[PDB]
């Protein structure tokens, strides 16, 4: 299967807001929709039939296994085959009735941290070659909505339903610090490309930055609706934010301009940068997977799925996109360059 680009056109959907009030549609440069590392097509190659709504997805490094988080279960899929289509293992959670909200791998690929709508973070050993639950980290907050692992792998950051960011020492299995400030649940989290700043989004309509060493809050950005997703550009400089309205906003880090992007009709549930940083995806309650040029958000592709798209990940090699669905499945896309 070969694919070719075909140019299309829409009413202006990408706007730049400068330091003064000014809002203008972006004049796209010649490499906005075209170039080395810019997708030309996203081919759906696998459906992963989890059987519960897939609220968290992650992909191994190197690319090999996909982890889908459902209700009381994480399933493991081997995408080195297409095609395929069946899980190779599964990680059954304490009570099988709570949604998984986040799963993250340590870089070695044999530890997975799982969090969700229960007062417990689970650490799974995947050495293994069959999974074992290694530790349960108990919080007093009823739920975790999102996790981030520090670049050195020593620390897990958990976004709690009470607004606190809990900092867990992974090797010692112990709560070491809390970043306090969000006045409603923290829904999302990322770390700056230099490793020194934490960025979190909240149901309190704010994005906050934190000094990972100082321990406390640096910036605050106040918004008109709840924040459901965010990502920090891996090459630096830009922070993409997904909002309850439908907007994706791309904030210029430490600078006073931003882009506002309008191709969703509903809440922006998840978002992820390509590891090359040159493009990113967002996913919507409106069933869309939208791919966007960094930073100004020219529309690289759109994929309309059967149901709400709750979660996504992009593989470390930028070859694959995985989305999690309200239709109780995940979809594996091969990125065609």
Residue of 148, 149, 104, 109 whose CA lies nearest to 122: 104
Q: Which stretch binds a copy of itself (CB under 8 A): 52-60, 147-155, 244-252, 296-304?
A: 296-304
Query: Which residues within the stretch 5-24 sit at the binding site for a copy of itself (CB under 8 A)?
Result: 5-14
Q: How many residues bind another protein (CB under 8 A)?
A: 18
- Residue 253 contact, options another protein, a copy of itself, none, Cβ 5-8 Å cut-off depending on partner type: none
- Residue 99 contact, options a copy of itself, another protein, none, Cβ 5-8 Å cut-off depending on partner type: another protein
What residue has token string 């010649």?
30
Shortest distance (Å) from residue 161 CB to another protein: 6
Asked if 292 interacts with another protein (CB under 8 A), we say: no
Question: Which of 308, 315, 323, 331 contacts another protein by CB under 8 A?
Answer: 308
Assigned token pair, 139: 């919080």
Asked if 4 interacts with a copy of itself (CB under 8 A), we say: yes
Residue of 269, 320, 273 whose CA lies nearest to 294: 273
Question: Which of 17, 34, 73, 276 contacts a copy of itself by CB under 8 A?
Answer: 34
Asked if 179 interacts with another protein (CB under 8 A), we say: no
Task: Phi first, then psi: give them for residue 152, nearest 5 degrees.
Answer: -85, 0
- Residue 187 contact, options another protein, a copy of itself, none, Cβ 5-8 Å cut-off depending on partner type: another protein
Asked if 248 interacts with a copy of itself (CB under 8 A), we say: no
Segment 110-115 long-range contacts (CB within 8 Å, at least 24 positions apart): 111/170, 112/58, 112/67, 112/74, 113/147, 113/149, 113/156, 113/170, 114/69, 114/74, 115/144, 115/145, 115/146, 115/147, 115/158
In Å, what is the CA distance from 290 to each residue of 129, 176, 279, 304, 309?
Answer: 36, 38, 11, 9, 11
Query: Which residues within the stretch 41-70 sit at the binding site for a copy of itself (CB under 8 A)?
Result: 41
Give 28 or 275: the residue with its C-beta nearer to a copy of itself: 28
Assigned token pair, 178: 């809390």
Which residues share a beta bridge with 272?
281
Asked if 298 interacts with a copy of itself (CB under 8 A), we say: yes
Supply the DSSP string of 81-105, one letter for each residue: SS---S-SEEEE-SSTTSBEEEEEE
- Residue 326 contact, options another protein, a copy of itself, none, Cβ 5-8 Å cut-off depending on partner type: another protein
Give 104 or 293: the residue with its C-beta nearer to a copy of itself: 293
Backbone Cα Rg of the chain: 19
Q: What's the rounded Cα separation, in Å, for the pair 279 and 154?
A: 29
Question: Which of 117, 169, 237, 334 contacts another protein by CB under 8 A?
Answer: 117
Site residues, another protein (CB under 8 A) = 53, 55, 99, 101, 117, 143, 145, 161, 184-185, 187, 203, 267, 269, 285, 308, 310, 326
């Amino acid at each position: 299967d070969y694919f070719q680009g075909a140019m299309g056109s829409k009413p202006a959907y990408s706007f730049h807001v400068t330091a003064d009030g000014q809002m203008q549609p972006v004049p796209f440069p010649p490499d906005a929709l075209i170039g080395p590392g810019i997708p030309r097509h996203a081919r759906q190659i696998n459906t992963l039939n989890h059987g519960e709504v897939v609220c968290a997805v992650t992909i191994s490094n190197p690319t090999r296994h996909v982890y889908t988080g459902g209700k009381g279960c994480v399933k493991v899929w081997d995408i080195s085959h297409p095609g395929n289509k069946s899980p190779v293992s599964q990680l059954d959670c304490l009570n099988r009735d709570n949604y998984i909200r986040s799963c993250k791998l340590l870089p070695d690929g044999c530890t997975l941290i799982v969090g969700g709508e229960a007062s417990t973070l689970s650490i799974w050993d995947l050495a293994a070659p069959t999974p074992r639950i290694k530790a349960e980290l108990t919080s007093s907050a009823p739920a975790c909505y999102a996790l981030a692992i520090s670049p050195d792998s020593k620390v897990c950051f958990s976004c709690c339903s009470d607004g606190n960011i809990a900092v867990w020492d992974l090797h010692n299995q112990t709560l070491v610090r809390q970043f306090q400030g969000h006045t409603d649940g923290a829904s999302c989290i990322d770390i700056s490309n230099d490793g020194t700043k934490l960025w979190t989004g909240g149901l309190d309509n704010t994005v906050r930055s934190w000094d990972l060493r100082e321990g406390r809050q640096l910036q605050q950005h106040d918004f008109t609706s709840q924040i459901f997703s965010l990502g920090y550009c891996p090459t630096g400089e830009w922070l993409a934010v997904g909002m309850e309205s439908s907007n994706v906003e791309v904030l210029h880090v430490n600078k006073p301009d931003k882009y506002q992007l309008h191709l969703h009709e509903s809440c922006v549930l998840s978002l992820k940068f390509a590891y090359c940083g040159k493009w990113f995806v967002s996913t919507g309650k409106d069933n869309l997977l939208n791919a966007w040029r960094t930073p100004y958000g020219a529309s690289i592709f759109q994929s309309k799925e059967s149901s709400s798209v709750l979660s996504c990940d992009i593989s470390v090699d930028d070859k694959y996109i995985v989305t999690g669905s309200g239709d109780k499945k995940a979809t594996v896309y091969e990125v065609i360059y």
